[PDB]
From a paper:
To trap PilBGm in a conformation similar to the ATP-bound state, PilBGm was incubated with AMP-PNP, a non-hydrolysable ATP analogue, under conditions similar to those that facilitated crystallization of PilB:ADP. Crystals formed when AMP-PNP was added to a final concentration of 50 μM to a 120 μM solution of PilBGm—a ratio of 5:12 nucleotides to ATP binding sites. The crystals diffracted to 2.3 Å in all three dimensions. Six chains could be built in the asymmetric unit, which together formed an elongated hexamer similar to the previously identified PilBGm hexamer. Henceforth, this AMP-PNP bound hexamer is referred to as PilB:AMP-PNP. The overall structure of PilB:AMP-PNP is similar to that of PilB:ADP, in that it has four closed and two open packing interfaces. PilB:AMP-PNP is distinct from PilB:ADP in that only two closed interfaces have ADP bound, and they are bound with partial occupancy. The other two closed interfaces are bound to AMP-PNP with full occupancy, henceforth referred to as the closed-AMP-PNP interface. AMP-PNP is also bound with partial occupancy in the two open interfaces and will be referred to herein as the open-AMP-PNP interface. This occupancy pattern suggests that the two closed-AMP-PNP interfaces have the highest affinity for AMP-PNP, and by extension ATP, while the open interfaces have a moderate affinity for ATP, and the closed-ADP interfaces have low affinity for ATP. However, H420 of the HIS box coordinates the γ-phosphate of AMP-PNP and the side chain of T411 from packing unit 2, suggesting that the HIS box plays a role in mediating the inter-chain cooperativity of ATP catalysis.
Author numbering:
A (entry chain D): 182 to 261, 267 to 291, 294 to 567
B (entry chain F): 180 to 261, 268 to 567
C (entry chain C): 180 to 261, 266 to 291, 294 to 567
């Protein structure tokens, strides 16, 4: 009965073109709201007796902790396919649940916004016969799209590609995709060991979270396989310190990793209402613009039009830090250099930081100065 | 049983008739007293028998559904009497001290036009909260009416088309349609954790109780840049100094100029009792020193209450707000981006007609609603 | 009636007569002695026969309700003697017997004028604690007078119009009107939990016994900026070093610059006995090396006590405080935000006239309150 009601809330939202579902308890009421074309509408008022059953069911569908009701929790629901991003939030009179429709509908690497130098290092690293490629960033930074874009360039009938994902974001023909199931025993570590017995060529791990997974992944890269994975780290230099703090010996990181990227997703200025805004040149220089390049900058910002919902932005751009494991960086790891020394050395060799990549796209007029300062830290 | 039940109920009802905000039930080694906070000042209203020390505090526990067996640890609950009270139990060395916070929605005034804003200031505040995105900061110390200003703004925005989420420490009043979160930092639910959760909750309007550090300030500023309306508070000396506070926290100057729509500063002064109101012979030179023009000085008629039954013999009844409403004008924005300090931002705001809190206090002094000592206590000279 | 019973009573009462703070009963291989700590310095007061060491120790443990059967482990307890004197008893198992330490706990000044503050330092301290918000930090090593200074500040602020709440470990003196909470960590009542409960108790003034970790420091400094007056202590060695200690713990710089009203550093130095005192011929050059200006050098008259029965033949009777009272002046705030080190902060405070502890000691030397040897013993050179 309650399962039927929850399924109706989900199936009614896809029929009514809703992008978000809001299940909200209050002291004297309990309502469900759909966001349709940016506007919330009350679409249902279930009785107050059912609010515990409806919330628990959704938390079970999202594999969340039903015993904990005081802390925020975030999960995911897949229905057939429609995928929901679940967010639980402890209010005064119960838990509020928000489900956000994920619109899956460009896997092409040449259209992701990599600068030519960055795209060169990235393509060079994934076409090596073995080694590790790490794509880092926070949630919603485009990591998975970058990984799948790399798998597209590599997917040939001549190579065996196997992935361990939690969950499988997209179904790829020719790619052997395994979905994780921890309660049964199918985690990243178990899949990696089986992959080594599967005559593999390219291995993709959804994320390196623990030393047990890093150990097998590093070993697989040194054995002669190409290993791609992700981590949640601040930048590419800090990714090295993360692996070391997990217990991986420094010489194994120096020799196994081909390449580490760090990326953030910024908004692209609306091409219809963009126009220059007056920014003192000293502000640009304080943000990392060299004094010589300063005067040549034209910082664009959308004023807000109908083609962008009066936001001034339409679309997104990528700010990439593509750091190859250059020999200078390898020696620094072997000498136990800290994150600061590794970042400075990478900048000396021409590896642009995410801040510098953002200033480049600001120079090209495709993003605003506030976006650069919002998603990147200073160097 | 009944003598204590009657006494405890009398403690709760006399607080309502005196219009007190809080009740303090405090045991000591050789005494026992009850204090009401009336218009921000505590007063001794009762010295009950010390034999009833444990009986009185235990009765309120039962009303608050708290643990009578535990008397060594702090406890917190709520009471509804057929008027709501928030209860806080503190274990001192001579018994449990109980504090009760009166929460009457009926007494709360939420219409923005009845909060005491001057019409030009009210226009800029309303314009700021009805913009689709940006940040609005209401500054002042705790107990300066900031939450009422925020609740008034949220009530003006509480439509079924928007999702409003608040993070409060604690939640003073609850409103239908508004998703409110009470902070519980002992278990990890601080302002930052609730802010990052709000960003995954598909928000439209976000209210934060106070911005206390760089981490929360960064999430708040950047949420105001990504299409959300952000309402929050800080404790600063005035509206112009709120700019320097954010910069010192670590926020980039360009993001402050881009994200903030408006900053207000406010203080709560006590309102002179209308019945015992009498003219006070404040020397003209004292008024000129406070900021009154010398040509206006002799015309000023300062008032103060002599004390009567209607005002609990305090001379005051109610509160008035001294407001400074500073919109993020383009002139002020250009000052921020050129590294201007607090003094030159304050001069620029006064140049453009933005009244300071001292000027707002002196206006209320001229109208006879507040006293000369209240103006000097809560405001500084310009 | 028994010999040892009378002897133990003599040791306990003689300490009260001599104004001792601590009693040390120490057995060694070939000797046995009793030492009193008088004005912070230990003196041998008795040499009882070593044969009696087990009877004296056993007798004290009976009065302290300690276990006489156990002689290999440390034990702790209390003793109350009848007008009452309390003793905190600590037993320690040395190689040649059990050592016993007794700590006298006597309430028997409250007045700030009798503690040793110079008029300028007193003015800065009084205006800082009378502000409606901010943090006041009293720093110094153990036994430097921090609790007395805070109790003295609370006494000047103890009004019926304000709510004062303290978290102490332990509570050392009971004040009517002040809500004092004693820490009990084993049940979860620590400084952090008590401070969080105070914030739900409608506070005005909060006193935290000591800041011993970053978690408590952040809560306390943020509560002060929210709009409360907060008093606490740290174990640092001067006022400028307290600034960097807070920063090194992880407190954000804007919090230190904007939320701290004032920081004090202090040491206790012994006073020359008024009965004993005689002038001491200190070479004028030696005074100059200690930090006295050349103009003032020849005018100094330094005194030293020869020793009399009234001062226990030490030349010193009582103690006085050397205070460095540093208000958070605007010049100092700019240094916190610009990353200055302790030496820069110290040089700048001296430039603005903030007297160091050494200079305060030299002031007491000129006035004949303390001796030249005491200034060099308890203060470092600048
Ligand atoms: N280069 C890009 N430019 C613009 N948008 C992008 C880009 N790459 C990905 N996106 C968008 O990012 C969204 C999904 O981001 P995603 O790659 O899932 O983040 P993520 O890093 O995988 N988060 P998580 O899986 O929780 O670690 C998609 O809807 C894409 O439209
Ligand atoms: N200004 C003063 N002049 C003379 N004597 C003082 C002064 N201040 C305190 N004392 C005495 O010296 C002793 C100092 O103890 P107290 O003030 O508790 O030190 P404290 O800093 O609290 N030590 P601790 O709590 O262990 O860090 C007390 O017994 C006071 O009676
Ligand atoms: N403009 C006003 N006029 C009269 N009373 C007010 C006004 N603003 C606030 N108050 C009262 O003062 C009390 C304290 O205000 P509140 O906003 O809760 O404190 P803070 O400013 O610390 O958030 C409230 O309970 C409210 O009833
Ligand atoms: Mg102490
Ligand atoms: Zn547009
Ligand atoms: Zn009256
Ligand atoms: Zn003497």
């Amino acid at each position: 009965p309650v399962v039927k009601l929850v399924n109706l809330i989900l199936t009614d939202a896809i029929k009514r073109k809703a992008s978000d579902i809001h299940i909200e308890p209050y002291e004297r009421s309990f309502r469900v709201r759909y966001r349709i074309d940016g506007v919330l509408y009350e679409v249902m008022k279930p009785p107050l007796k059912l609010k515990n059953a409806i919330t628990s069911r959704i938390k079970i569908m999202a594999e969340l902790d039903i015993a904990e009701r005081r802390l925020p929790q975030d999960g995911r629901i897949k229905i057939k396919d429609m995928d929901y991003r679940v967010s639980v939030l402890p209010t005064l009179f119960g838990e509020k649940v928000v489900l956000r429709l994920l619109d899956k509908s460009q896997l092409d690497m040449t259209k992701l916004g990599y600068e030519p130098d960055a795209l060169h290092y990235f393509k060079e690293a994934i076409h090596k016969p073995f080694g590790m490629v790490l794509v880092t960033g926070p949630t919603g930074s485009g990591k998975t799209v970058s990984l799948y874009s790399a798998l597209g360039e590599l997917n040939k009938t001549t190579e065996n590609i196997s992935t361990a994902e939690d969950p499988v974001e997209f179904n790829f023909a020719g790619i052997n995709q395994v979905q994780m199931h921890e309660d049964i025993g199918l985690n990243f570590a178990a899949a990696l060991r089986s992959f080594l017995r599967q005559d593999p060529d390219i291995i993709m791990i959804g994320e390196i979270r623990d030393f047990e997974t890093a150990e097998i992944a590093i070993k697989a890269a040194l054995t002669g396989h190409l290993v791609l994975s992700t981590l949640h780290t601040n930048d590419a230099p800090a990714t090295i310190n993360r692996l070391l703090n997990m217990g991986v010996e420094p010489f194994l990181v120096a020799s196994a990793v081909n390449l580490i990227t760090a990326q953030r997703l910024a908004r692209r200025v609306c091409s219809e209402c963009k126009q220059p805004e007056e920014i003192p040149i000293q502000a640009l220089i304080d943000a990392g613009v060299s004094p010589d390049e300063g005067p040549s900058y034209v910082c664009y910002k959308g004023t807000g039009c109908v083609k962008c919902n009066n936001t001034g932005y339409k679309g997104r751009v990528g700010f990439y830090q593509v750091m190859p494991m250059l020999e200078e960086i390898r020696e620094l790891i072997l000498n136990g250099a800290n994150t600061a020394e590794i970042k400075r050395e990478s900048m000396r060799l021409g590896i642009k930081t995410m801040r510098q990549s953002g200033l480049t796209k600001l120079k090209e007029g495709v993003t605003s100065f506030e976006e650069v300062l919002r998603v990147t830290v200073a160097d």
